[PDB]
């Protein structure tokens, strides 16, 4: 595995910050004019994180179609993702409107509601079966059907009902609950365990709309998730770990949303996750059971 040797050269030489800065310098810059319109200021969580115009998700709403969300379309892998920010109190209805309109089957949440003593996301799903949520502005109803709480992630089964048409859909919410407040996980085991649980659910499959992935800004942890998934899929499709250049894939995803992978440590962690996951892709089926074990899921 040449990326495993690239990893060792970079790690041995302590060069992660340098490689990361090079990625930042080569990354695309496209206009984000709609995000910056004054009428959309209260729809953005961070003033410096905006979707590009060319890849932004549009709400089917005549008044204002804007949500801070981007479509990442990885053509060779046949995988697409919607990356978005953690919803704001005033955008929770827009968030679920997007899920409905885009026909998503899964929502992947990589942050906690409170981190570092501050709110990173609105509580946008119900906490109890008998207390459903109604989003009056977008005419949707959301019910918690069941919740499976594990040590490293929670999976929830939600029912989303379009009140205008009486149609309902089941949505799976995958909530990775153990990313540390600072830095990255020391081992990728539980994250890979988590990624494969999302895969197994059918949420990433092309018969559904794109999975919705978010953290607080929708670029750091979210970027690590998509980067790992796409790199492992490409290695699967070529069955060749050495034909996959993580840096090139990351630059191709940065054509669709700015800033993906925020720190050099997230970049290092992305390499580690792909290197370890490649053991499963290349036919060592048993490693998945070791991840579950090492993840201490129970």
Curated annotation (Swiss-Prot):
Q: Which residues are in the Tyrosine-protein phosphatase domain?
A: 3-277
Positions carrying Cysteine sulfinic acid (-SO2H) are: 215
State the membrane topology: Peripheral membrane protein
User: Phosphotyrosine (modified residue): where?
Assistant: 20, 66
Entry keyword annotation includes Nucleotidyltransferase: no
What EC number(s) is this enzyme filed under? 3.1.3.48
User: N-acetylmethionine is carried by which residues?
Assistant: 1
Q: Which residues form a coiled coil?
A: none
Q: What is this protein called?
A: Tyrosine-protein phosphatase non-receptor type 1
Q: Which domain of life is it from?
A: Eukaryota
Alphabetized UniProt keyword annotations: Acetylation, Endoplasmic reticulum, Hydrolase, Membrane, Oxidation, Phosphoprotein, Protein phosphatase, S-nitrosylation
Residues bearing PTM Cysteine persulfide: 215
Section of the entire sequence shown: 1 to 298 of 435
Q: Name one GO cellular component term.
A: glutamatergic synapse
For the protein in the UniProt heading, the enzyme class is hydrolase
Summarizing the function annotation, the protein's role is:
Tyrosine-protein phosphatase which acts as a regulator of endoplasmic reticulum unfolded protein response. Mediates dephosphorylation of EIF2AK3/PERK; inactivating the protein kinase activity of EIF2AK3/PERK. May play an important role in CKII- and p60c-src-induced signal transduction cascades. May regulate the EFNA5-EPHA3 signaling pathway which modulates cell reorganization and cell-cell repulsion. May also regulate the hepatocyte growth factor receptor signaling pathway through dephosphorylation of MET.
Q: Which reaction does it catalyse?
A: O-phospho-L-tyrosyl-[protein] + H2O = L-tyrosyl-[protein] + phosphate
Q: Where is this cross-link: N,N-(cysteine-1,S-diyl)serine (Cys-Ser)?
A: 215-216
* Positions of modified residues (Phosphoserine): 50, 242-243
**What post-translational events are described?**
Oxidized on Cys-215; the Cys-SOH formed in response to redox signaling reacts with the alpha-amido of the following residue to form a sulfenamide cross-link, triggering a conformational change that inhibits substrate binding and activity. The active site can be restored by reduction.
Which tissues express it? Answer: Expressed in keratinocytes (at protein level).
Species whose genome carries this gene: Homo sapiens (Human)
Name the reported effect of residue 50 to A/D. No phosphorylation
Listed under subunit, the entry gives: Interacts with EPHA3 (phosphorylated); dephosphorylates EPHA3 and may regulate its trafficking and function. Interacts with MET. Interacts with NCK1.
